[PDB]
């Protein structure tokens, strides 16, 4: 006798009409059969759905600021953008614009910013993980023609929240498979399209559920977003982390949640910050702080096991020397500056998705028949940039003091030492040219100068992309002077002043500005 | 009737207004009907669910160390991580953070670690290998069924071969097991057959896998513990201590008639098998034991069968594979590099021939492009240093150079063995013989440096098996020498170098 | 049973005779069944497909060009084309629906233009994103023998609107 729960749920028109009809059918019928399992299944799925249960949101931004500044560190542009969004929701009360998209390398706090937006606004949090989504009927649901039929995860996570307005986190909108039975990008389109959110059609419920109340935010590693989804997203683009930012994330946020997780009280374990810097530099190559959670959690766990099987030491202190006793040998190492001015070697700046690295460039001009060999897993765009740079050297051959027959008389080899690591892009062109000049005059390159820039034939230095990880890489490696092109000078207003105060950044416009600074002797 | 049974276990109160609810419904129905069989079945599948009766978990770690070492030989880092998990499990009574995962190739004992951990922690072992009430009758869910069969509140649970669970077909999604793994959704796990929320906290979870090909909602909660391949002394110690007695007991061989020597086992490992684990060794040992039984029934004259390194061609067939040895009998113009792979290590001889010609450069032996780039880099190092090595510098145009590696139809690629090929080029150009007792590894650059390599341990075990006495490693791999067994350190004269001059000083028998 | 919704729908002859043969077949079946669930699903789809419902279209041209000028700026060739359609439409009863292909750079105003044509001609609006459509089952659907069988996604949007003359925005044909 479930007649009072339909009126108790206060459902809309089609929901009440199909449930009243369903109830009567079940009532006429016989219990304990599988068809009564399907019918009774349909009613107790149609009663868990939040048809009218709304959570009150909060409309203050000082408290939202002082919630978002905790649980995270240094995402001030991202948190600024979120406070713009909640600043809009205090006046519009329902956003009809795009959806907040959190893009960044793996390890940055995207899901945790989902939780902190959800705590900051006042709504209930929910996360729909993707990656295993191949079916469109995994988001929209199946119909009830099959014996085992249960709805899609959208209205089921809506059922485990039980609130009309949650905060969905569409996690990993990039990662989904290619062998797809339906088109889930159309369903994920119509959950995000405000003309199609008033009328959402679940295949199990077969009714008209309203999704014009839910706040959606999504996460992303890259932009392999499917085509109908990309114009409904507002990209915030979380960038990578420095070393001192990871030291303050581990200092203020990762250690108190691993001392508490292993129940280490204050008189047991003291991890020195140079050990944290040694895990950053020496053990991990992530852009985020997930691997810092792995080696910090493993480090605290080894401190626990030592405090049980020792019973003599009561205060374990871990400086930068004892990690080799605990976390083993050093796994990786970063490239750093050279000590003396070598002739052919030029340090360049390379940009990867796990952060920025240095990029050593050796050349060798031996007396031969004039054949150039390029080694080091170089892409074709790099090889075109090298022979462009060699064309610059051949055009400026007489004023650089170079014997102009070196195309015919001297074999030239260009090697980049990490031979197994593939690498591509024009952004090392003015490096290569310098190395070639340095091998054709015997003028050594001063080892404290890194450089980046795309070279053209008339000598000018075109702009490059991503100065942030490259200046962090030159900052980490012990480089003192960085030669950037001029039109990347704008990016110098987005760099932390530890780097600017540490480095001596010289913008260049042409190749004579590079050859004047970067070589020891005057050309 | 059944009331003393439902109060005899003292089930929680919610499940006893449910159980007493179908009991007072059972008072108002016919006994012999099949609906009453569904009712009595639903009573029976709740009085077997372990609502209580925990197993006392053990807190000391020395007896846990030896009761881990009583069934597995050399998984020392894994056993360390398990004792650390039992240390925080000793302090924190309920660890609900991430979940232990054992990633490794098939053959190592990652499944039987569920047994060693199972009687090491003291709890009961339930293994799960992954790869609603109605009139027709229904069994409960698999996750709950293991629990009921075990009948204990704290049973270790294993998720075996999640790499083979998630296929390319419609099967189990990530939902029904990450709702088991997550901490906040385990206080109320309502099983669909019972519709009663049953707790899953204080239940240890171990999941084993052969790769990191794990679904993305699950890889967030799984600590990737790697299990490297066993070395040959470790495989000998696993065969002799743990694997011969289980074949003797599953073949019923009493101890007086069969003797499988140590040279027999090392002959199987070196000559008859190539894998990372010890499974193919057990196919060879089981074949050896059943041939011993057949040779006792078919001949009642002899009774004791002695099996050693010589008579493994009478048994087991003939030698299927072989490994590389040091060519110590002469010192010639070739070098001995080191090669690393998943099965283990291998010696990798490298040959050059430099005849008079036009300067043709031929590279041979199924070489990858990164290796050919390392030959060109090494030859550039020789051309840049032609005068002080004593080479007439016109060899780029007056002598053809051939670089061959002997095992054809074997694909070879990698940045390593650059200084080996530079040593072979300096050797065949100067006429200076490379001393045969020296193996080499490293990566050459144009300035003459030696860059680090990977897999130093298997290269050092390959060089120790091959008969090499002197190994030239890079300087920045001295660190990896902190994890070599000291018999291998004591037998190998390891020289960490950082340039090509330190290489050519040692590796060439005459001074340059 | 359900003939009140069949004669309430005013179906054409083949669709009416087929759905009343299916409903007449359904009554001689025992309920609580699998194939009876299949037949109730098929009747449930054919009772919500539009067979007669038609929206009244706009005859005025000055009000139309006023609308397409209020929500866009200077898409003169397309707005001319829509005035051509609304100029022909005032001379006859029904025309074949025009099949257009707007080709241009991103951000040039092709989707909101479809919203403008929908609001101006009097038609109703629904869009089907063709980006990621990889198989014919999103257009023709599957046979009802199959378990997860639905009538494509054209008929689902025809049923989602509920009219015989909508404006399909077949968006991103080249994707």
């Amino acid at each position: 006798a479930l007649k009072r729960k339909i009126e108790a749920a206060k459902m809309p028109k089609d929901a009440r009409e199909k449930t009243e009809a369903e109830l009567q059918k079940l009532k006429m019928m016989s219990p304990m059969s599988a068809e009564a399992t399907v019918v009774r299944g349909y009613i107790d799925w149609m009663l868990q759905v939040p048809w009218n249960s709304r959570s009150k949101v909060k409309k203050d931004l000082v408290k939202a600021q002082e919630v978002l500044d905790t649980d995270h560190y240094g995402l001030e542009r991202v948190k600024d953008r979120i406070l713009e969004y909640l600043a809009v929701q205090s006046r519009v009360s329902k956003i009809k614009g795009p959806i907040l998209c959190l893009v960044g390398p793996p390890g940055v706090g995207k899901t945790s910013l989902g939780q902190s937006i959800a705590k900051a606004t006042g709504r209930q949090y929910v996360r729909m993980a993707l990656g295993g989504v191949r079916d469109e009927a995994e988001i929209r649901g199946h119909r009830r023609t099959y014996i085992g039929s249960m709805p899609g995860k959208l209205i089921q996570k809506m059922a485990k929240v039980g609130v009309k307005n949650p905060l969905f986190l569409l996690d990993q909108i990039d990662k989904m498979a290619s062998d797809m039975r339906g088109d889930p990008a159309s369903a994920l389109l119509e959950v995000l399209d405000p003309e199609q959110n008033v009328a959402f059609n679940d295949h199990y419920l077969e009714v008209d559920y309203d999704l014009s109340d839910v706040m959606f935010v999504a996460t992303s590693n890259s932009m392999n977003i499917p085509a109908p989804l990309l114009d409904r997203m507002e990209v915030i683009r979380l960038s990578g982390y420095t070393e001192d930012e990871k030291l303050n994330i581990a200092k203020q946020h990762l250690l108190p949640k691993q001392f508490e997780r292993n129940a280490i009280k204050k008189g047991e374990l003291t991890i020195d910050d140079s050990a944290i810097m040694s895990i950053i530099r020496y053990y991990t190559r992530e852009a985020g702080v997930r691997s810092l959670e792995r080696e910090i959690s493993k480090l605290c766990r080894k401190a626990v096991k030592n405090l049980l099987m020792d019973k003599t030491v009561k205060h374990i202190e871990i400086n930068g020397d004892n990690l080799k006793d605990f976390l083993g040998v050093q796994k990786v190492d970063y490239g750093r500056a050279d000590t003396e001015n070598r002739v052919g070697q030029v340090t360049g700046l390379a940009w990867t998705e796990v952060g920025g690295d240095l990029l050593t460039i050796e050349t060798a001009c031996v007396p031969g028949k004039g054949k150039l060999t390029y080694t080091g897993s170089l892409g074709e765009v790099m090889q075109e940039s090298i022979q462009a740079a060699l064309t610059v050297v051949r055009a400026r051959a007489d004023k650089l003091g170079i014997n102009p027959d070196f195309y015919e008389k001297r074999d030239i080899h260009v090697h980049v030492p990490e031979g197994a690591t593939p690498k591509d892009g024009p952004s090392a062109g003015i490096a290569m040219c310098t190395a070639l000049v340095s091998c054709l005059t015997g003028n050594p390159v001063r080892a404290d100068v890194a450089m980046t820039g795309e070279i053209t034939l008339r000598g000018l230095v075109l702009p490059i992309g991503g100065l942030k990880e490259k200046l962090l890489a030159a900052h980490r490696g012990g480089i003192k002077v960085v030669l950037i092109p001029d039109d990347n000078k704008r990016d110098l207003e987005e760099i932390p002043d530890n780097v600017i105060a540490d480095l001596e950044i010289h913008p260049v416009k042409r190749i004579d500005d590079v050859l004047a600074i970067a070589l020891e002797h005057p050309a | 009737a059944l009331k003393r049974k439902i109060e005899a276990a003292k089930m929680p109160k919610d499940a006893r207004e449910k159980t007493e609810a179908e009991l007072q419904k059972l008072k108002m129905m016919s006994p012999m009907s099949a609906e009453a069989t569904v009712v009595r079945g639903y009573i029976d599948w709740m009085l077997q669910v372990p609502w209580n009766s925990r197993s006392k978990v053990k807190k000391d770690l020395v007896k846990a160390q030896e009761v881990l070492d009583t069934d597995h030989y050399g998984l020392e880092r894994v056993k360390d991580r398990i004792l650390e998990y039992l240390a925080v499990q000793s302090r924190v009574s309920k660890i609900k953070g991430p979940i232990l995962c054992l990633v490794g190739p098939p053959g190592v004992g990652k499944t039987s670690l569920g047994q060693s951990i199972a009687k090491a922690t003291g709890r009961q072992y339930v293994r799960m290998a992954l790869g609603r009430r109605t009139y027709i009758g229904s069994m409960p869910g698999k996750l709950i069924q293991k629990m009921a069969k075990v009948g204990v509140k704290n049973p270790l649970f294993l998720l075996d071969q999640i790499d083979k669970m998630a296929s390319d077909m419609r099967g189990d999604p990530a939902s029904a097991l990450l709702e088991v793994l997550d901490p906040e959704q385990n206080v109320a796990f309502n099983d669909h057959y019972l519709e009663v929320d049953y707790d899953l906290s204080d239940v240890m979870f171990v999941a084993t896998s052969n790769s990191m090909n794990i679904p993305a909602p699950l890889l967030d909660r799984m600590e990737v513990i790697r299990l490297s391949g066993y070395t040959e002394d470790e495989k000998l110690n696993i065969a002799k201590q743990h694997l011969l007695p289980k074949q003797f007991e599953r073949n019923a061989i009493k101890k007086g008639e069969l003797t499988i020597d140590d040279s027999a086992i090392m002959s199987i490992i070196r000559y008859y098998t190539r894998e990372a684990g010890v499974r193919s060794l057990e196919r060879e040992i089981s074949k050896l034991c059943r041939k011993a039984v057949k040779n006792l029934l078919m001949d009642k004259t002899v009774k004791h069968i002695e099996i050693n390194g010589d008579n493994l061609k009478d048994f087991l067939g003939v030698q299927k594979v072989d490994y590389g040895r040091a060519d110590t009998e002469n010192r010639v113009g070739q070098v001995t590099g080191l090669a690393w792979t998943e099965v283990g290590g291998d010696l990798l001889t490298i040959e050059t021939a430099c005849v008079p010609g036009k300067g043709k450069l031929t590279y041979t032996g199924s070489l990858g492009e990164v290796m050919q780039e390392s030959i060109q880099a090494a030859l550039t190092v020789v051309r840049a240093r032609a005068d002080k090595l004593g080479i007439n510098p016109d060899f780029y145009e007056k002598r053809d150079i051939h670089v061959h590696v002997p095992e054809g139809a074997t694909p070879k690629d990698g940045p390593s063995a650059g200084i080996a090929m530079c040593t072979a080029l300096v050797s065949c150009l100067t006429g200076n013989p490379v001393r045969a007792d020296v193996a080499m590894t490293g990566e050459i650059t144009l300035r003459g440096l030696v860059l680090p390599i990977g897999g130093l341990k298997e290269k050092l075990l390959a060089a120790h098996r091959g008969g090499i006495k002197v190994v030239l490693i890079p300087d920045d791999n001295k660190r990896d020498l902190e994890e070599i067994p000291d018999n291998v350190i004591a037998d190998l004269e390891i020289h960490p170098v950082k340039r090509i001059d330190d290489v050519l000083a040692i590796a060439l028998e005459h001074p340059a | 049973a359900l003939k009140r919704k069949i004669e309430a729908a005013k179906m054409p002859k083949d669709a009416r005779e087929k759905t009343e043969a299916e409903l007449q077949k359904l009554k001689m079946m025992s309920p609580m069944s699998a194939e009876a669930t299949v037949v109730r699903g098929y009747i449930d789809w054919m009772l919500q497909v539009p067979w007669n419902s038609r929206s009244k279209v706009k005859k005025d041209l000055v009000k139309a060009q006023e609308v397409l000028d209020t929500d866009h700026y200077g898409l003169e060739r397309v707005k001319d084309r829509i005035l051509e359609y609304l100029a022909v439409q005032s001379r006859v009863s029904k025309i074949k629906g025009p099949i257009l292909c707007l080709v241009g750079p991103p951000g040039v105003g092709k989707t909101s233009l479809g919203q403008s044509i929908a609001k101006a001609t009097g038609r109703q609006y629904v869009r089907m994103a063709l980006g990621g459509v990889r198989d014919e089952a999103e257009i023709r659907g599957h046979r009802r023998t199959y378990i997860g069988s639905m009538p494509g996604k054209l008929i689902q949007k025809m049923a989602k609107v509920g009219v015989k003359n909508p404006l399909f925005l077949l968006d991103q044909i080249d994707k």
Partner: peptide, 7 residues
């Protein structure tokens, strides 16, 4: 109750 094979 009777089983029935679906495609």
């Amino acid at each position: 109750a009777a089983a029935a094979a679906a495609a």
